[PDB]
Amino acid sequence: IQRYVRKDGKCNVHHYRYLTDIFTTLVDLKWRFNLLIFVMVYTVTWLFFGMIWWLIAYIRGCVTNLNGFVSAFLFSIETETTIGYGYRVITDKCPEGIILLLIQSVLGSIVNAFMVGCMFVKISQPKKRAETLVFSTHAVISMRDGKLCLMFRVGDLRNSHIVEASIRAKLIKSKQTSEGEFIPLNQTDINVGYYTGDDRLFLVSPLIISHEINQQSPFWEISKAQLPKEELEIVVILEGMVEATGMTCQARSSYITSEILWGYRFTPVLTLEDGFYEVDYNSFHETYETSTPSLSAKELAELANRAES
Amino acid sequence: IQRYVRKDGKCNVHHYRYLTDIFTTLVDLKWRFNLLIFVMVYTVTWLFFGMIWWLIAYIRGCVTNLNGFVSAFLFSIETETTIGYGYRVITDKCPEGIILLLIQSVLGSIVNAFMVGCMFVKISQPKKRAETLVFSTHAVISMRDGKLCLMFRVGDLRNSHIVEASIRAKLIKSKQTSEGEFIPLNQTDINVGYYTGDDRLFLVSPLIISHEINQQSPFWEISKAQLPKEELEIVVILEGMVEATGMTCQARSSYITSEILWGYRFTPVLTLEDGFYEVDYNSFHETYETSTPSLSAKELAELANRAES
Amino acid sequence: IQRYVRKDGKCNVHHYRYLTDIFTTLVDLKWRFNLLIFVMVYTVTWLFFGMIWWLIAYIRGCVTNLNGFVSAFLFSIETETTIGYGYRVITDKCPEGIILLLIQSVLGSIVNAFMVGCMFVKISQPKKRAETLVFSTHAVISMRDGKLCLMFRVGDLRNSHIVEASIRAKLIKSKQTSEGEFIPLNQTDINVGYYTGDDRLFLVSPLIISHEINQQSPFWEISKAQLPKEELEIVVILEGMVEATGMTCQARSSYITSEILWGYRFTPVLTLEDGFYEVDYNSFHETYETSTPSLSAKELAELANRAES
Amino acid sequence: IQRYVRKDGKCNVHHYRYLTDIFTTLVDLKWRFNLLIFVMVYTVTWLFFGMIWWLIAYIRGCVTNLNGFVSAFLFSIETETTIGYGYRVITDKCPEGIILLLIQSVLGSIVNAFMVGCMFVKISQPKKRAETLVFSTHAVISMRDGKLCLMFRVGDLRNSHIVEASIRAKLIKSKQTSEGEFIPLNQTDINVGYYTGDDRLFLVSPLIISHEINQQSPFWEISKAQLPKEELEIVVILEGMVEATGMTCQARSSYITSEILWGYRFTPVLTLEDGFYEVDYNSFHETYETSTPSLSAKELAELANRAES
Ligand SMILES: [K+]
Ligand SMILES: [K+]
Ligand SMILES: [K+]
Ligand SMILES: [K+]
Ligand SMILES: [K+]
Ligand SMILES: [K+]
Ligand SMILES: [K+]
Ligand SMILES: [K+]
Ligand SMILES: [K+]
Ligand code: NA
Ligand code: NA
Ligand code: NA
Ligand code: NA
C-alpha cells in the first residue's frame, strides 16, 4: 500500500452541494482561469445591461450619441465602471431609463464586491505561509535522558512569527478489532506535548519535537528489528496563525516506516554570531547515528525496572 | 416530544437590541431583499443629497445645465458614484455648493463601505462550507476491541482542508434532580476524544468518531432492550476553520433514540486505486449488523470482571 | 468598596504608545467624529495636492480652465475621487504635472484604503453581537442531585449561532497571603465545566451554567449565614465567534455578594409548541425559592460522610 | 552567551520559497517603500497597457485626440482609474480596441485589489496592539501563602479589551542529555495556570502572573545562592484577540537570570477613586524586598515536611 500523505502535504485521496458556496470554489482556481472568469462576468453584465439600454432605446426612437451594437456596448462600460466619458450622456425623456441606470449602477457594486473581494481573498490566502514552514526529512528514534524518543525537527524560514502555533501528530495504520472489524486507515493521536502545553510552540529557531515512547505510545513494542517490518505512517501537523493577518494555517508532512531512522540523532543548527544567533540551515535535515539499544521501549523499561539493586 | 436539532442542523427553537448591530441582521436576509435594500439606500441618498442641490440652487437662481427634478437627480448620481459626465458641471459662485460637494463625496464613501463591505461578507460567509461537511445518517453501537462503542461517521466532501477541525457531542435529555427540580433539555457533553486530543480531527477521508461507553458514559446503563425505551437525543457538532479563509464554521447534526442502531457497524469506504485512495461515497451512510451482546455496558463489564479465572 | 465589573460589562477601571497603531484608536470614536475626521482627511489632502497644482501652474503660467483658489480646489477633487468632469483637463506641457498626477492618483488609493477599510471594520465590529448575549440578573445557590451549586443563566437572543462558544468565570476578592502581602483584586478561576469540555457551549435556548461547590470551590466554606458577610464578586465571561463572520467576541457580567441568592432556583423557560420550542423569555431572569440547607458545602459534605450507617 | 529574546520582543535570531506568497513579504516593508512599490506597479501597468494602445493605433492610423507618447500615457490613466476625462474618447473603428478596453478595465480591478487590500491589511495589522501590552521589567521570587513563587506582572494600557487572552511561559536554557547529546536552546514550558484555566486572563487592570515553584518546576533546585550562578532565560508570551477586530496577536518579553530578583515583591497599583479604580502606573515595574528564605524550593518543602510534630 502507498502513503496517505506526501512529504509536502498533499493527500493521496480522491472524492452537487458545491454550488451552495460558489464562492469557496471560486477562490480555488489557478490565476489564469480566475482572471478569465473575472473577464467573463464583467463583459457579460456589460452585455446584458447594455442590451436593455438598446431595448428601451428601440421603443423610444435618455439617449445621446448611440447608434449600433458597437456603440451600446461602450455606454454600459462608461456606467458600470462609472467611467462616463461625456460623449454618451443621459437625458430626461423616458422613465425606463432613469430606473434602469439605478439598477445598473447599484448592481455594478454587487458585481464589484463579488469579484474584488474574491480577488482579495486569494491574494491573501493563508495556505501560502505553510510553504515556508518545514519539517525534517526523516524522523529519528534515539535515547534522551534515559527514555527512548521519536523525534522530528520543525522549522520556520520566514522571519515573521506564527502566533498561537501548535504541533500535533497522528499515527496512521490499519488495524483489526478483536471482534473482527478491519479499519482501513485508522488514526490515533501521538503525544507530542499535549498534556503539558509543551505542544504549544514558540517557533523561532528550528525545534525538535519529541514524542516519548512510553506505555501509551504506539511505538511501545516496536524494536529496531520490528520497525522495518511495520506498515505505519506518522502524519505531522502544524497549525497556527500568520502574525501579519488573522489567518489560521496548517502545514503537514508524513513519515513512512522507512523514513524513521532508529539509532540516529539530529545535527545541531545553532551558533552564536557576535550578538545574534546563526541558524546553519544546511544541517537542518541532516542527522548522524549514535549508540542506541535495539530493544523495544517496552523491554528497555522492563530491564531497567529489574535493575533495582 | 419532538427533536431539538434537525438532521441537517437547524434547531426547533423560537425566540429591541437588534438595532445595536443593524449590520449583523443586514447580512442575514436572502439575496433578493439584500439587493433591494442596497438599491433603496443608494437611491434615497441620491434623493436626499440631490434635494439639497435643488435647495441651494433655488436660493442662487455652482450649477451648470440643471432644470427640473428629473435633472437634479442625475447630478447627485454623477457625484456619489463619481461618474461626473461633464454635462452637469460645478462652478465657483456659491460657498454652499463647495462644502456640500465635500459632504456628499465623503458620505458617498461611507455609504460605499457599509454596503460593499456588507456585500463582501455575505458572499464570503462561512456557514456555507458547513454544507459540504456531512454526518452518517445513523449512529451505531457495537463492540470494538472489547469495549462497547457509540459510533457515527463524519465526512468532508470538498477537497480543501478544514484547519483546526474538531468534533464534540452533547447528550440531550430531560432529567429530574433528586431534589425535585425538572430540567427541560439538559445538555451533558459526551466524550469523543477530548482527554487525548483525539477529538482533534485530521479530516481528509471519512472518519468514524467513537465514544466508548464507560462508567462515565450516559449510555452506561442503556442495554439493547432499554435503548428504544429511552427519550434521548445526541447532538453532534463539528467546528473548525475554512482553509481558504480565516473563517470559523460549525456543522451540526442529531441522533434521536430511534436512529441509533444497536448491533450494527459501518461499511468501509476506502479502496486504494493505482496510487491514490478511492472513497466509495455510496457506502458512507450504509451499515450492516454483526454479533453484538444485548447487555448494557455496565453489565458487560461486570461479567468481564467476574471472569478472572 | 464598589464593584469591578458592571452588570452590563463595562469595567470600573481607569488607566504615548497609542500612536504605534493610530488605526486601533481610529475605530473607537463614535460615528459623528469618525464621519468628521473622514471629512477632514479627505478635504486636507484635496487641499495639499490642490496647492501643489497651483504651485507648478504658477511657474508655468498641464492646465486647462483653472483660475483662482476656488477653481484649483475643484481640480484636486476631480482627480482624487477620479471624478474628472472634463472641464478641467490635463495637457502635455510640463513634466512636473505628469509625475504629480501619478503621485496624487496613487496616494488617492492609499487614503481610500485607510478610510474605507477603517469605515468597514467599525461597521463590522463584533463587540456589537455581545449586546444580544444575556446573563441572568442574579445567581443562585441551591442543591442539585445531592451537591450544592452556584448557578447563573445564560441566553442568546439572536437566532444566529455563536460558534466555538465558551463560558468561564473568575472569582474576584482581595486576600492576604499568610506572609503579609495584600493582593487588591486577586482573580481566581471558578470551575464551570473546564475539566470535561462542559464549558464548551451549544448555546441555542437559554442555559443554566452550574458551578458545583466542592472542596476546590471558593464557596466551599461560605454558608447561608456567611454569604451576606462576604465581600466577593463573580465575573462571568462568555467568549466565541459570530457565526456570520470570523469575529471573536466577549460578553461579560458580574455578580456581587448581594446578587447571589441562597436557597433559590431558576424558573423554567421551555415549552414545546406544535413542532417547535417556545422560550418564554419573561421567566428568564425570574427565580423562586426552595428548601435549601443553610450550611456551608464543607459541612454538608462532612455530615453526609458521617452518615455511613 | 547573549539572550534569545529582547525585553521588547524581537528575537536575536538570523535565518527561494518567499515568492510562493509574494503578498506576505509585501506587507512587511516600511511605509515609504510600500508607497513606492504601489506607485511603481500602478505606473508600469499604465505604461504597458498604454503601450498597447499605441501599438494598435499605429496599425490603424478607437482613437480620439491622441498624438505622441506624452498623450498615450494620459489615456491609460483615464481608463485604469476610470477617470475618463472625455477629451480622449473611444470610437467604433477597430476590433482590437474594444477587447483591449475590456482587458484593461478588468485587469484594473485586479491591480486594485492586490494593492488596496494590501494597503488595508498593513493599516489593520495586529502586531501593533502588542505595543500597548506590557510586562514588568523584572520578575521576582518570594513566598506566597506558604509556597515559593516566580512572579512577573502583566498590563494592558489601552482601555479596549483583549478577547480570549492567555499567558504562557517557556524556560530556555541549554542542557545535556545523560546520553551525551547537547541541546542548544532547549525550550521547556513553565506552569502559569494551564491546568486550571487560570492562564486564561481577564486582563483589565495589571495582573501578577505567578508560577509556583513545585517539584515539577525548573526552579525546584535553584536557591538564592545558585540563581546568579545559573544561565537561564524565561520567555514570557501573551496571546489573544484584539476586541475591535478578529485579529490574533502576540506580545513577548524575556527574563534573564540577572533580572529575576530573589526576595522581592511587586508594589501594588490599585486605588479606588470615588466610584472607579485608579491604576497608579508609576508603581507598575517597581518592587520592594521582604523577608524571603534563601533556600531552594526543594529544601524549603523538605524541612516543612520534617516539621510534622
Ligand atoms: K470613477
Ligand atoms: K469618472
Ligand atoms: K468622468
Ligand atoms: K490541558
Ligand atoms: K487537555
Ligand atoms: K479572522
Ligand atoms: K467626464
Ligand atoms: K482538557
Ligand atoms: K485542561
Ligand atoms: Na519565525
Ligand atoms: Na478534505
Ligand atoms: Na442562538
Ligand atoms: Na484592557
Short mmCIF file of C-alpha atoms in Angstrom, two decimals, chain A residues 1-6 9-15 17-18 20-21 23-25 27 75 78-79 82-92 98 101-103 105-107 109-110 112-114 117-118 120-121 125-127 164 166-170 172 175-190 194-195 199 235 237 239-241 246-250 252, chain B residues 31 35 38-39 42-43 46 67 70-71 73-74 77-78 81-88 112 116-117 119-120 123-132 142-147 151 156-165 193-208 241-247 265-266 268-270 272 274-279 281 288:
data_model
loop_
_atom_site.label_atom_id
_atom_site.label_comp_id
_atom_site.label_asym_id
_atom_site.label_seq_id
_atom_site.Cartn_x
_atom_site.Cartn_y
_atom_site.Cartn_z
CA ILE A 1 0.00 0.00 0.00
CA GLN A 2 1.09 3.58 -0.80
CA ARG A 3 1.27 6.50 1.66
CA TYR A 4 -1.66 8.65 2.84
CA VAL A 5 0.13 12.00 2.92
CA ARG A 6 3.01 13.19 0.76
CA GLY A 9 1.38 17.87 2.40
CA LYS A 10 -0.98 16.91 -0.41
CA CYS A 11 -3.04 13.81 0.35
CA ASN A 12 -3.46 10.78 -1.87
CA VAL A 13 -7.24 10.81 -1.54
CA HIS A 14 -9.92 11.23 -4.20
CA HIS A 15 -13.58 12.13 -3.51
CA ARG A 17 -23.73 20.83 -2.99
CA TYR A 18 -20.63 22.65 -4.35
CA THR A 20 -24.18 26.17 -2.00
CA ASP A 21 -20.96 28.23 -1.74
CA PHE A 23 -17.54 31.46 -3.67
CA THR A 24 -15.49 28.72 -1.99
CA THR A 25 -14.80 27.01 -5.31
CA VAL A 27 -11.06 31.05 -4.92
CA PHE A 75 -22.30 53.03 -22.84
CA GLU A 78 -18.99 54.01 -19.00
CA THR A 79 -21.75 53.27 -16.48
CA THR A 82 -18.53 54.63 -13.70
CA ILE A 83 -16.18 55.89 -16.43
CA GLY A 84 -18.83 58.07 -18.12
CA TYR A 85 -16.84 59.85 -20.85
CA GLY A 86 -19.50 62.51 -21.50
CA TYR A 87 -19.83 61.68 -25.17
CA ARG A 88 -22.66 59.26 -24.36
CA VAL A 89 -24.82 61.23 -21.90
CA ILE A 90 -28.25 60.53 -20.35
CA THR A 91 -31.33 62.78 -20.72
CA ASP A 92 -34.79 63.26 -19.15
CA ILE A 98 -33.88 56.58 -15.05
CA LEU A 101 -29.49 53.46 -14.51
CA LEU A 102 -30.21 52.93 -10.82
CA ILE A 103 -30.45 49.15 -11.31
CA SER A 105 -25.19 51.41 -11.02
CA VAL A 106 -26.30 49.51 -7.93
CA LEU A 107 -25.74 46.03 -9.46
CA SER A 109 -21.28 47.48 -6.99
CA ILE A 110 -22.68 44.00 -6.29
CA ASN A 112 -17.71 44.65 -7.81
CA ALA A 113 -17.73 43.10 -4.33
CA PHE A 114 -18.24 39.51 -5.56
CA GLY A 117 -13.43 40.71 -2.55
CA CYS A 118 -12.90 37.45 -4.40
CA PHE A 120 -8.68 39.99 -2.33
CA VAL A 121 -9.02 36.66 -0.51
CA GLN A 125 -4.98 33.22 1.32
CA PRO A 126 -3.01 31.70 4.22
CA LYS A 127 -2.17 28.26 2.75
CA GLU A 164 -0.65 30.52 18.72
CA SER A 166 0.98 24.28 17.78
CA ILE A 167 2.12 20.80 16.73
CA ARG A 168 0.12 17.54 16.78
CA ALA A 169 0.77 14.12 15.31
CA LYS A 170 -1.48 11.28 14.27
CA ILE A 172 -1.93 6.07 10.79
CA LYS A 175 -5.84 -2.47 12.43
CA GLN A 176 -8.30 -5.21 13.20
CA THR A 177 -10.59 -5.08 16.23
CA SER A 178 -10.55 -8.34 18.17
CA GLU A 179 -14.24 -8.57 17.19
CA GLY A 180 -13.30 -8.89 13.53
CA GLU A 181 -13.84 -5.35 12.14
CA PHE A 182 -10.98 -4.18 9.91
CA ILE A 183 -10.35 -0.46 9.99
CA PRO A 184 -8.59 0.85 6.81
CA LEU A 185 -6.52 3.89 7.85
CA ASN A 186 -7.32 4.21 11.50
CA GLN A 187 -5.98 7.47 13.00
CA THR A 188 -4.62 7.61 16.56
CA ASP A 189 -3.08 10.77 18.07
CA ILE A 190 0.58 10.61 19.22
CA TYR A 194 -0.42 17.94 24.72
CA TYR A 195 -0.64 17.20 28.46
CA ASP A 199 2.90 21.21 22.19
CA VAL A 235 1.28 12.34 9.87
CA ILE A 237 0.51 18.60 11.53
CA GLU A 239 -1.27 24.77 12.90
CA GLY A 240 -1.35 28.42 13.88
CA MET A 241 -1.89 32.00 12.81
CA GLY A 246 -5.83 36.79 11.38
CA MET A 247 -5.42 33.81 9.09
CA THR A 248 -5.08 30.35 10.55
CA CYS A 249 -2.89 27.94 8.59
CA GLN A 250 -1.82 24.28 8.52
CA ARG A 252 1.54 18.93 7.05
CA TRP B 31 -30.24 37.90 -1.68
CA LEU B 35 -30.25 43.56 -3.40
CA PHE B 38 -28.89 48.08 -1.42
CA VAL B 39 -30.99 49.84 -4.12
CA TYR B 42 -28.35 54.13 -2.72
CA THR B 43 -31.39 55.78 -4.37
CA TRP B 46 -29.11 60.19 -4.21
CA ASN B 67 -33.62 72.26 -14.79
CA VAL B 70 -35.63 64.84 -13.39
CA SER B 71 -32.29 66.67 -13.88
CA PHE B 73 -31.46 63.51 -9.72
CA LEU B 74 -28.88 62.91 -12.48
CA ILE B 77 -25.72 60.26 -9.33
CA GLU B 78 -22.73 61.66 -11.26
CA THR B 81 -20.73 57.14 -7.91
CA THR B 82 -18.22 59.74 -9.09
CA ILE B 83 -19.49 59.29 -12.67
CA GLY B 84 -19.47 63.04 -13.45
CA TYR B 85 -20.42 63.11 -17.15
CA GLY B 86 -19.29 66.72 -17.70
CA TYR B 87 -22.66 67.88 -18.94
CA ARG B 88 -23.63 68.86 -15.39
CA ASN B 112 -19.96 52.60 -0.10
CA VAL B 116 -19.77 46.99 -0.37
CA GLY B 117 -18.30 45.50 2.81
CA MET B 119 -21.94 42.69 0.11
CA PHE B 120 -18.48 41.19 0.71
CA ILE B 123 -20.62 36.34 -0.33
CA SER B 124 -17.81 35.25 1.97
CA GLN B 125 -19.86 33.86 4.87
CA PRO B 126 -18.54 30.55 6.27
CA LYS B 127 -21.83 28.84 7.20
CA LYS B 128 -21.78 27.70 3.57
CA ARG B 129 -18.75 25.40 3.93
CA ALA B 130 -20.70 23.53 6.60
CA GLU B 131 -22.98 22.40 3.76
CA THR B 132 -20.22 20.13 2.40
CA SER B 142 -21.22 -2.29 18.61
CA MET B 143 -18.15 -3.78 20.20
CA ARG B 144 -14.63 -2.58 19.47
CA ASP B 145 -11.54 -4.30 20.88
CA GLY B 146 -13.52 -5.50 23.92
CA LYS B 147 -15.47 -2.39 24.87
CA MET B 151 -20.13 5.40 16.70
CA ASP B 156 -15.76 16.22 4.18
CA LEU B 157 -16.86 16.31 0.53
CA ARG B 158 -14.73 19.24 -0.65
CA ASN B 159 -11.08 18.50 -1.48
CA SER B 160 -9.96 21.53 0.53
CA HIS B 161 -8.99 21.10 4.17
CA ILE B 162 -10.65 22.31 7.30
CA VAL B 163 -7.97 23.67 9.63
CA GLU B 164 -8.01 23.12 13.43
CA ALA B 165 -11.06 20.92 12.90
CA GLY B 193 -11.66 12.15 22.39
CA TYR B 194 -11.33 15.28 24.47
CA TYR B 195 -8.91 13.85 27.04
CA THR B 196 -6.34 12.75 24.45
CA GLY B 197 -6.66 15.33 21.66
CA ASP B 198 -8.20 12.53 19.66
CA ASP B 199 -11.15 14.85 19.18
CA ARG B 200 -8.74 16.97 17.13
CA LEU B 201 -9.51 15.82 13.62
CA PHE B 202 -7.28 15.27 10.61
CA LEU B 203 -10.38 15.12 8.44
CA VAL B 204 -9.45 14.11 4.94
CA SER B 205 -11.18 10.82 4.11
CA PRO B 206 -14.37 9.94 6.16
CA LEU B 207 -13.80 9.15 9.84
CA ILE B 208 -15.70 7.12 12.41
CA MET B 241 -11.68 26.83 10.04
CA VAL B 242 -12.09 27.02 6.26
CA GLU B 243 -8.56 26.53 4.92
CA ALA B 244 -9.20 29.19 2.27
CA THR B 245 -10.10 31.97 4.74
CA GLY B 246 -9.84 32.71 8.45
CA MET B 247 -13.48 31.83 8.89
CA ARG B 265 -21.39 -1.43 12.18
CA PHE B 266 -20.24 0.93 9.43
CA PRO B 268 -15.88 0.56 4.86
CA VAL B 269 -15.42 3.26 2.20
CA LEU B 270 -11.71 3.00 1.33
CA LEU B 272 -6.55 2.03 -2.98
CA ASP B 274 -3.31 2.72 -8.59
CA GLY B 275 -1.53 5.33 -6.44
CA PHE B 276 -4.41 7.30 -4.85
CA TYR B 277 -7.21 6.39 -2.43
CA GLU B 278 -10.76 5.96 -3.72
CA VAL B 279 -13.54 6.83 -1.27
CA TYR B 281 -19.14 7.56 -1.03
CA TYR B 288 -24.52 -3.76 8.49
#
